[PDB]
Scaffold this motif. Structure first.
Motif, PDB file in Angstrom:
ATOM      1  N   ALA A 110     -14.953 -12.344  -8.394  1.00 53.26           N
ATOM      2  CA  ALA A 110     -14.644 -11.165  -9.190  1.00 53.26           C
ATOM      3  C   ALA A 110     -15.802 -10.865 -10.112  1.00 53.26           C
ATOM      4  CB  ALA A 110     -13.371 -11.366  -9.987  1.00 53.26           C
ATOM      5  N   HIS A 167      -3.860  -1.987   4.465  1.00 55.77           N
ATOM      6  CA  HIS A 167      -2.882  -1.035   4.950  1.00 55.77           C
ATOM      7  C   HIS A 167      -2.904  -1.006   6.468  1.00 55.77           C
ATOM      8  CE1 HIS A 167      -0.942   2.783   5.932  1.00 55.77           C
ATOM      9  NE2 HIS A 167      -0.340   2.686   4.760  1.00 55.77           N
ATOM     10  N   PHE A 195     -12.622 -10.771  -1.250  1.00 53.90           N
ATOM     11  CA  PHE A 195     -11.967  -9.523  -1.626  1.00 53.90           C
ATOM     12  C   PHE A 195     -11.829  -8.591  -0.434  1.00 53.90           C
ATOM     13  CE2 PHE A 195     -13.645  -9.983  -6.205  1.00 53.90           C
ATOM     14  CZ  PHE A 195     -12.636 -10.883  -6.467  1.00 53.90           C
ATOM     15  N   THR A 196     -10.772  -7.788  -0.435  1.00 51.88           N
ATOM     16  CA  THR A 196     -10.519  -6.857   0.655  1.00 51.88           C
ATOM     17  C   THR A 196     -10.106  -5.485   0.146  1.00 51.88           C
ATOM     18  OG1 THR A 196      -8.238  -7.659   0.822  1.00 51.88           O
ATOM     19  CG2 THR A 196      -9.866  -8.638   2.315  1.00 51.88           C
ATOM     20  N   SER A 251      -6.005   8.314   0.142  1.00 53.66           N
ATOM     21  CA  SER A 251      -7.136   7.643   0.756  1.00 53.66           C
ATOM     22  C   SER A 251      -8.191   7.282  -0.279  1.00 53.66           C
ATOM     23  CB  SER A 251      -7.750   8.520   1.841  1.00 53.66           C
ATOM     24  OG  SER A 251      -8.275   9.716   1.286  1.00 53.66           O
ATOM     25  N   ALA A 259      -7.980  -2.101  -0.102  1.00 50.50           N
ATOM     26  CA  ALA A 259      -6.569  -1.793   0.083  1.00 50.50           C
ATOM     27  C   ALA A 259      -6.337  -1.083   1.407  1.00 50.50           C
ATOM     28  CB  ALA A 259      -6.061  -0.951  -1.056  1.00 50.50           C
ATOM     29  N   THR A 260      -7.326  -0.314   1.840  1.00 49.17           N
ATOM     30  CA  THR A 260      -7.214   0.406   3.098  1.00 49.17           C
ATOM     31  C   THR A 260      -7.082  -0.541   4.279  1.00 49.17           C
ATOM     32  OG1 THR A 260      -9.627   0.532   3.266  1.00 49.17           O
ATOM     33  CG2 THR A 260      -8.487   2.412   2.293  1.00 49.17           C
ATOM     34  N   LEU A 313      -6.931   4.267  -2.177  1.00 52.65           N
ATOM     35  CA  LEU A 313      -6.992   3.052  -1.402  1.00 52.65           C
ATOM     36  C   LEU A 313      -8.432   2.663  -1.125  1.00 52.65           C
ATOM     37  CD1 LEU A 313      -4.053   3.695   1.017  1.00 52.65           C
ATOM     38  CD2 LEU A 313      -4.084   2.427  -1.128  1.00 52.65           C
ATOM     39  N   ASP A 314      -9.357   3.592  -1.333  1.00 48.88           N
ATOM     40  CA  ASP A 314     -10.767   3.283  -1.151  1.00 48.88           C
ATOM     41  C   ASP A 314     -11.192   2.219  -2.141  1.00 48.88           C
ATOM     42  OD1 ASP A 314     -11.063   5.005   0.940  1.00 48.88           O
ATOM     43  OD2 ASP A 314     -11.958   6.628  -0.236  1.00 48.88           O
ATOM     44  N   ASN A 315     -10.574   2.231  -3.315  1.00 50.71           N
ATOM     45  CA  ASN A 315     -10.754   1.148  -4.263  1.00 50.71           C
ATOM     46  C   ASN A 315      -9.659   0.139  -4.007  1.00 50.71           C
ATOM     47  OD1 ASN A 315     -12.925   2.466  -5.412  1.00 50.71           O
ATOM     48  ND2 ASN A 315     -11.702   3.389  -7.044  1.00 50.71           N
ATOM     49  N   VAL A 316      -9.066  -0.375  -5.079  1.00 42.45           N
ATOM     50  CA  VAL A 316      -7.972  -1.332  -4.981  1.00 42.45           C
ATOM     51  C   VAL A 316      -8.396  -2.496  -4.085  1.00 42.45           C
ATOM     52  CG1 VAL A 316      -5.549  -1.662  -4.401  1.00 42.45           C
ATOM     53  CG2 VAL A 316      -6.319   0.509  -5.320  1.00 42.45           C
ATOM     54  N   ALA A 317      -9.216  -3.373  -4.647  1.00 46.04           N
ATOM     55  CA  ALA A 317      -9.755  -4.493  -3.907  1.00 46.04           C
ATOM     56  C   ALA A 317      -8.755  -5.636  -3.858  1.00 46.04           C
ATOM     57  CB  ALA A 317     -11.056  -4.951  -4.519  1.00 46.04           C
ATOM     58  N   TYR A 318      -7.791  -5.506  -2.954  1.00 45.38           N
ATOM     59  CA  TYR A 318      -6.760  -6.512  -2.739  1.00 45.38           C
ATOM     60  C   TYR A 318      -7.337  -7.846  -2.303  1.00 45.38           C
ATOM     61  CZ  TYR A 318      -2.966  -8.875  -0.254  1.00 45.38           C
ATOM     62  OH  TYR A 318      -2.073  -9.802   0.224  1.00 45.38           O
ATOM     63  N   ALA A 319      -6.778  -8.921  -2.847  1.00 49.07           N
ATOM     64  CA  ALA A 319      -7.176 -10.269  -2.466  1.00 49.07           C
ATOM     65  C   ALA A 319      -5.972 -11.191  -2.501  1.00 49.07           C
ATOM     66  CB  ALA A 319      -8.270 -10.786  -3.375  1.00 49.07           C
ATOM     67  N   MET A 335     -18.474  -9.314  -8.457  1.00 45.56           N
ATOM     68  CA  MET A 335     -18.249  -7.904  -8.164  1.00 45.56           C
ATOM     69  C   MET A 335     -18.340  -7.011  -9.383  1.00 45.56           C
ATOM     70  SD  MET A 335     -18.057  -7.374  -5.092  1.00 45.56           S
ATOM     71  CE  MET A 335     -17.427  -5.698  -5.177  1.00 45.56           C
ATOM     72  N   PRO A 373       0.819  -1.212   0.000  1.00 47.22           N
ATOM     73  CA  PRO A 373       0.000   0.000   0.000  1.00 47.22           C
ATOM     74  C   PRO A 373       0.853   1.262   0.000  1.00 47.22           C
ATOM     75  CG  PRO A 373       0.074  -0.949   2.176  1.00 47.22           C
ATOM     76  CD  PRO A 373       0.697  -1.956   1.260  1.00 47.22           C
ATOM     77  N   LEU A 431       1.479   2.580  -3.220  1.00 49.80           N
ATOM     78  CA  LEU A 431       0.298   3.203  -3.783  1.00 49.80           C
ATOM     79  C   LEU A 431       0.166   4.625  -3.269  1.00 49.80           C
ATOM     80  CD1 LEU A 431      -2.233   0.314  -3.594  1.00 49.80           C
ATOM     81  CD2 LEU A 431      -0.669   0.922  -5.438  1.00 49.80           C
ATOM     82  N   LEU A 432       0.553   4.837  -2.022  1.00 53.01           N
ATOM     83  CA  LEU A 432       0.579   6.192  -1.501  1.00 53.01           C
ATOM     84  C   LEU A 432       1.645   7.019  -2.206  1.00 53.01           C
ATOM     85  CD1 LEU A 432      -0.042   5.500   2.260  1.00 53.01           C
ATOM     86  CD2 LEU A 432      -1.602   6.462   0.566  1.00 53.01           C
TER      87      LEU A 432
END
Ligand SMILES: Nc1ncnc2c1ncn2[C@@H]1O[C@H](COP(=O)(O)OP(=O)(O)NP(=O)(O)O)[C@@H](O)[C@H]1O
Ligand SMILES: Nc1ncnc2c1ncn2[C@@H]1O[C@H](COP(=O)(O)OP(=O)(O)NP(=O)(O)O)[C@@H](O)[C@H]1O
Ligand SMILES: Nc1ncnc2c1ncn2[C@@H]1O[C@H](COP(=O)(O)OP(=O)(O)NP(=O)(O)O)[C@@H](O)[C@H]1O
Lengths: 311, 311, 311
Positions: A186, B72, B65-66, A162, B68-69, A165-171, A189, A147, A150-151
């Motif tokens: 996916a 972090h 899914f998670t 922020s 990014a925040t 990072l509100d998106n970016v659906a890490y898995a 979603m 992350p 990404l910042l």
DNA sequence: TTTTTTTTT
DNA sequence: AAAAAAAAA
């Protein structure tokens, strides 16, 4: 972008529809691109029902012959997202296309996951800047996602971190089979908000450690073919973008180059494009194209700054 | 940190559970990260049982899914243990992370095992000092481990040496296959008390002498891939820390650097981080980063005193 | 110190045992430290038999995790033999350890074989004097061994020379492959009477003249790795002591030192210790440490009298 | 009839 | 400079 509820029409039962929902199908086009046998094999379905269903998929999505001109006019609007640096934009001719599969060739320390980060942020730029304005999902499979970077890119493009990072659906995948469930989720979603990009750092890495073939192997390729087909199922529908990062397999007893990506032929035939990344001196790195019908082979430098990709 | 006894629930037989115990599985998360085929192949298990089991692994550990925040916020608390010297703390940006794999690049007399000692003691410091407060297990594979040095570092940090040696679960591998059994026993030991760090001086050294390939070789890589995957199985669960020390392989007919670690690509792609250690004049040594997504390349001195790592 | 006859138990056939005897295995611990594949490859053995065998090796020799404290208590009793002079006893901190590999760095006329003689006699001293009370085998590979010097040291320590020469199992290698047979015969001799020390003047010298690489070379290292592993197989079992003497390889186009031992990395990573020997004026010589985890670097004089090593 | 994997000195 | 060897529905 057509939800199955539109198929809740012409006499189909809504609970039959909600049987269909469980297949991971969630859009009419997905039904349109569904092979007859997969639709049959799921329980509680007579083939005549599939006659109705497919008749409706034809009823909404045309599937006939098309003029090359019309296809050109629809090719006119593909976004091809900026990579966040100019020379890559020249190599890729405006950057990575939506509706396609792409490939990272590297040995290690080639900044492929780096590029995955910068793309992951830069999809969120306004379209004038080339961003698809599409939320990004990032299927990591080595846990190496950062992350913090990404910042950093967020500093690079002036958008608040922020919001990015509100998106970016890490898995975080582990099992080879797990990636499949992550794909169906996916697709689940995809219905709600137009996403830009799927990224996968190491689609292939699990397949080494799990399938110590041959084998195996014949099973490994057997699984990858389905995986890649599913990636086509997503990409052919919702654009956004597909990115694949491949570990390398060094030949022995070859000639003169000691490389080639693992996964054998089946990966190779699938990808619309391909890339290769040799480290230069210092931060500098060298991109080089393979297997892009769109483009002549080319190569170029880029530094990996604190902001990563640049000059 | 979730024992299988929690899975002694939802109709699973306790003796089926105690069949599962023998696989080296001892935590629910390990079951969650277990590929379907490994779970099938062990005898006395119908696949439907695995449907139940995996359904429960999903029942306890979320795998969707998670944001990014959120990732972090969970990245915010990784300990990244102090190395016992400041300049290394700057290079590594607070030192070696938990939940990861690390790498010693050296030719000989580079103090890599030295650093392994100092880390082995310094994990026991209170967390304010960066120690994970986690018992440390040390899988030596050359027998070069020296308790005396641990007493020296014990002088260095004021803790009684006997308390330090009360932990430090030394183990002495010989066969390449032996390391595997030591891993399963490690996982067996993980259940009882939160350990900080796994160390391995020479994971790779046995593989030279045993597999005189090619080969072989194709078998050697075949084994290493599983080994490293298991190290991920531990690290992805219980943090603590994974340290790998690699002998070096000097190139012939190269250009201008005559190094690179053995083990080929498969080691390289696996590690989250990498380090390289050139001897300086006198005690002084030079660290230098490879392949850390978190960090820009950097380099720094440190002396190897009677207390070893320092300035 | 555990003969295979103890494994003539739990249903193993005595003639299967006498098949095993021919592998050069002669002790249970050697079986315990035997890799699975070497045990398989020898003919007349199903792998299940190896399950039985290894189960018994575990049945006699524990191979689990161990406390650092226990390892310290077992480190408390290593003999570390006196070198026959005080200043070397200070450098080496009580002299050369049992259960380890050691190294002579010299150019020529550095008295390395000299030291090998004095050690060869001084192992026979009573333990209070540091001698292991262990018969000594001396694998010469240049034929330079001199009984006369052993008689001189015998004058030096007051023991009758005939008693000293009653041991000292001299052996004269020629082929590089020959050293291997001498190792298996050594292991065969280990069973009967606790020996103190293996010495090898020039383990490496044959490898120059025979393998004029590269190569070769890749074969040369391929052979040395096995050789050194076998030396570990002996040393990890029966203590005694391993001594290695290396010819030197002078660099060209280096900086400022024109030395380094031949054998490349593979020798270097293997040795627990290392030494270096510059001639002084007259008889006087200078020892200097490399690569000993136990010890800080140090250096010291010693004369080579008629009694050789001294002051 | 389907399916490539692997670097050392 | 010059080096092989590896199965399973
Ligand atoms: N803080 C930093 N400062 C400068 N450069 C950095 C920094 N962090 C990362 N980099 C660069 O990014 C690279 C990271 O390696 P990279 O190739 O992106 O990982 P990778 O290709 O995925 N290898 P792997 O570990 O198998 O995933 C480093 O080698 C540096 O070149
Ligand atoms: N009779 C003697 N009187 C005094 N010093 C002696 C005598 N014999 C041998 N030496 C010493 O011992 C040294 C022998 O060389 P040394 O280094 O022991 O052989 P080496 O290192 O094995 N060289 P190499 O011939 O390649 O085996 C001589 O240089 C003298 O310093
Ligand atoms: N008593 C001591 N005093 C000073 N420095 C010491 C002492 N003991 C060890 N050292 C230092 O620590 C180094 C030990 O080598 P080191 O690189 O730690 O072992 P290694 O890298 O594992 N090589 P290997 O033998 O293959 O395991 C020495 O070269 C010295 O620089």
């Amino acid at each position: 972008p057509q939800p199955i509820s539109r198929l809740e029409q012409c006499g189909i039962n809504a609970n039959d529809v909600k049987k269909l929902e469980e297949a991971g199908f969630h859009t009419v086009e997905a039904v349109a691109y569904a092979p007859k046998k997969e639709l049959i094999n799921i329980k509680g379905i007579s083939e005549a029902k599939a006659d109705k269903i497919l008749a409706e998929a034809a009823k909404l999505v045309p599937m006939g012959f098309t003029t090359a001109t019309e296809f050109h006019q629809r090719r006119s609007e593909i976004i091809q997202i900026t990579t966040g640096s100019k020379e890559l934009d020249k190599l890729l001719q405006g950057g990575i296309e939506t509706g396609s599969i792409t490939e990272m060739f590297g040995e290690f320390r080639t900044g492929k996951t780096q590029i995955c980060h910068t793309l992951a942020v830069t999809c969120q730029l306004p379209i004038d800047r080339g961003g698809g304005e599409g939320k990004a999902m990032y299927i990591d499979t080595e846990g190496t996602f950062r992350p913090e970077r990404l910042l950093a890119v967020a500093e690079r493009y002036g958008l608040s971190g922020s919001d990015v990072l509100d998106n970016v659906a890490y898995a975080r995948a582990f099992n080879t089979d797990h990636q499949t469930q992550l794909l169906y989720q996916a697709s689940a979603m995809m219905v709600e908000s137009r996403y830009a990009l799927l990224i996968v750092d190491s689609a292939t890495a699990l397949y080494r450690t799990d399938y110590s073939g041959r084998g195996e192997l014949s099973a490994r390729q057997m699984h990858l073919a389905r995986f890649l087909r599913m990636l086509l199922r997503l990409a052919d529908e919702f654009g956004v973008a597909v990115v694949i990062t491949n570990q390398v397999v060094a030949q022995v007893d070859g000639a003169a180059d000691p490389k080639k990506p693992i996964g054998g032929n089946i990966i190779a035939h699938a990808s619309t494009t391909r890339l290769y990344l040799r480290k230069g001196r210092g931060e500098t790195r060298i991109c080089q194209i393979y297997d892009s019908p769109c483009l002549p082979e080319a190569e170029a430098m880029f530094a990996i700054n604190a902001d990563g990709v640049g000059d």
